[PDB]
Design a protein around this ligand. Structure first.
Ligand SMILES: *[C@@H]1O[C@H](CO)[C@@H](O[C@@H]2O[C@H](CO)[C@@H](O[C@@H]3O[C@H](CO)[C@@H](O[C@@H]4O[C@H](CO)[C@@H](O[C@H]5O[C@H](CO)[C@@H](O[C@@H]6O[C@H](CO)[C@@H](O)[C@H](O)[C@@H]6O)[C@H](O)[C@@H]5O)[C@H](O)[C@@H]4O)[C@H](O)[C@@H]3O)[C@H](O)[C@H]2NC(C)=O)[C@H](O)[C@H]1NC(C)=O
Ligand SMILES: *[C@@H]1O[C@H](CO)[C@@H](O[C@@H]2O[C@H](CO)[C@@H](O[C@@H]3O[C@H](CO[C@@H]4O[C@H](CO)[C@@H](O)[C@H](O)[C@@H]4O)[C@@H](O[C@H]4O[C@H](CO)[C@@H](O)[C@H](O)[C@@H]4O)[C@H](O)[C@@H]3O)[C@H](O)[C@H]2NC(C)=O)[C@H](O)[C@H]1NC(C)=O
Ligand SMILES: *[C@@H]1O[C@H](CO)[C@@H](O[C@@H]2O[C@H](CO)[C@@H](O)[C@H](O)[C@H]2NC(C)=O)[C@H](O)[C@H]1NC(C)=O
Ligand SMILES: OC[C@H]1O[C@@H](OC[C@H]2O[C@H](O)[C@H](O)[C@@H](O)[C@@H]2O)[C@H](O)[C@@H](O)[C@H]1O
Ligand code: FE
Ligand code: ZN
Ligand code: ZN
Length: 341
């Protein structure tokens, strides 16, 4: 009744959800699916209530009638006066990142290089960079642009999965969940860091969070920001300090979605859960913190300060913005209006 079923993607998010479920005294319980699209179907069926989604998936869910409920809000130096929950969201910067040592690699020499993407259908990892590449090349053959990639969610037999590694045992190669070694923001940046790919399509924050000792994970321990460069659309290369002038787009924040008929109940529950387990929550450091998982961004991004109310009670189209929505529709015509399930 006043209980919410969260949808977890893969086994590691399932483990975090179970902990939260326990600590919440079953105010939250957990359903699990192997992929975000499967979680979306659980929500539509009414077998789960909610999950936090990247903007590309919000577009999928939105066509099927799911609505945005609360948004991830990270820290800002502006609007600092306003409480986090009431503060407007800023959006994150989609960037293309290379190694400084890979000299003369620019935006205009990316063809036939090796790429690292968060997952198919995601904003920074896929929709933004592939949308630009389609427009620029006047071709829908974006599966032939890079020599080899890791793009979780593509055909495992294809060149788009050639660089993906699967799990400890090499199983689940290219699955779009955190079992895949090079999945997600952190995974795609790891793919670059280890020189599997020439370029990673991630967000600005990912680079900062996994360099200069911010991570402590074995692969990230010795990474230095100066060893990296951003690719700008004008063919230039900049330091990672210059993302405000060298990004591919600004992305809408990840946001919790639910069925419209459940939105109000999901919202009320989540606001109480974050008071307990959020950033300064009564129980966070002590028992459980919702927004931590050791750099793994499980359920929510680890840099989330709070979940924020939306305001102007936006539809999914208003939330994503007309800019981004037309980007996706145009790219989507390479792969006609309805729910995809
Ligand atoms: C790319 O991604 C990066 C990773 O997310 C991100 O870097 C991150 O930036 C944030 C800031 O947005 C940093 O948070 C900050 O961390 C410091 C610890 O070093 C904290 O310590 C202080 O916190 C204070 C309270 O909020 C803060 O006071 C604030 O209020 C004063 C009012 O007097 C004001 O001062 C002014 O600042 C203006 C804007 O910068 C400046 O122009 C003006 O001259 C004036 O001095 C500010 O509004 C100020 O915020 C203190 O200043 C301290 O910061 C604090 O929690 C703070 O929020 C993250 O540490 C940092 N992450 C990492 C890992 O480095 C980049 O910003 C992203 N880049 C782009 C382009 O988006
Ligand atoms: C890949 O390429 C495709 C194809 O080019 C791109 O899709 C186009 O994206 C454009 C930008 O989103 C979009 O441009 C249109 O621009 C006009 C004018 O821009 C306006 O700016 C105003 C700010 O002062 C703002 O108030 C307006 O809302 C608008 O943003 C817009 O107006 C049109 O519609 C009006 C209908 O009432 C009409 O009167 C007017 O004459 C215009 O036709 C419009 O809303 C839009 O922004 C263009 O529509 C897109 N083209 C297609 C085919 O859909 C992709 O974005 C590219 N992909 C990537 C990743 O970049
Ligand atoms: C589980 O949910 C119930 C219902 O919201 C919570 O009980 C409320 O707790 C608040 C403040 O913590 C009290 O002031 C109210 O009187 C309670 N409301 C009702 C209707 O019982 C409970 O706190 C939740 N538990 C956890 C651990 O999240
Ligand atoms: O792209 C402009 C767009 O803005 C819409 O709402 C704001 C929206 O804009 C970005 O996507 C931002 O990063 C998001 O966090 C934010 O939700 C607007 O309603 C829409 O019509 C359009 O103009
Ligand atoms: Fe994203
Ligand atoms: Zn910009
Ligand atoms: Zn509206």
């Amino acid at each position: 009744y006043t209980r919410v079923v969260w949808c977890a993607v893969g086994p590691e998010e399932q483990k975090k959800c179970q902990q939260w479920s326990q600590q919440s005294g079953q105010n939250v319980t957990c359903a699990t699916a192997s992929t975000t699209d499967d979680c979306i179907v659980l929500v539509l069926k009414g077998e789960a209530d909610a999950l936090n989604l990247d903007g590309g998936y919000i577009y999928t869910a939105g066509k099927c009638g799911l609505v945005p409920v609360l948004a991830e809000n990270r820290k800002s130096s502006k609007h600092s006066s306003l409480d986090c929950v009431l503060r407007p969201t800023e959006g994150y910067l989609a960037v293309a990142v290379v190694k400084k040592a890979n000299e003369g690699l620019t935006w205009n020499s990316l063809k036939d290089k090796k790429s690292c993407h968060t997952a198919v259908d995601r904003t920074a990892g896929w929709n933004i960079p592939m949308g630009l590449i389609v427009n620029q090349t006047g071709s829908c053959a974006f599966d032939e642009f890079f020599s080899q990639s890791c793009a979780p969610g593509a055909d495992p037999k294809s060149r788009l999965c050639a660089l993906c590694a699967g799990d400890d045992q090499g199983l689940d190669k290219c699955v779009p969940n955190s079992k895949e070694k090079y999945y997600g923001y952190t995974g795609a940046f790891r793919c670059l860091a280890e020189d599997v790919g020439d370029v990673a399509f991630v967000k600005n924050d990912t680079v900062w969070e996994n360099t200069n000792g911010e991570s402590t994970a074995d692969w990230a321990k010795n990474l230095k920001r100066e060893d990296f460069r951003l690719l700008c659309l004008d063919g230039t290369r900049k330091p990672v300090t210059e993302a405000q002038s060298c990004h591919l787009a600004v992305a809408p924040n990840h946001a919790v979605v639910s069925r419209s008929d459940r939105a109000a109940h999901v919202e009320q529950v989540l606001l109480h859960q974050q008071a307990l387990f959020g950033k300064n929550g009564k129980n966070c450091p002590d028992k459980f913190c919702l927004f931590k998982s050791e750099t793994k961004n499980l359920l929510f991004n680890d840099n989330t300060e709070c979940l924020a109310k939306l305001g102007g009670r936006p539809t999914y189209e208003e939330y994503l913005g007309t800019e981004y929505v037309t980007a996706i529709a145009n790219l989507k015509k390479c792969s006609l209006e309805a729910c995809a399930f």
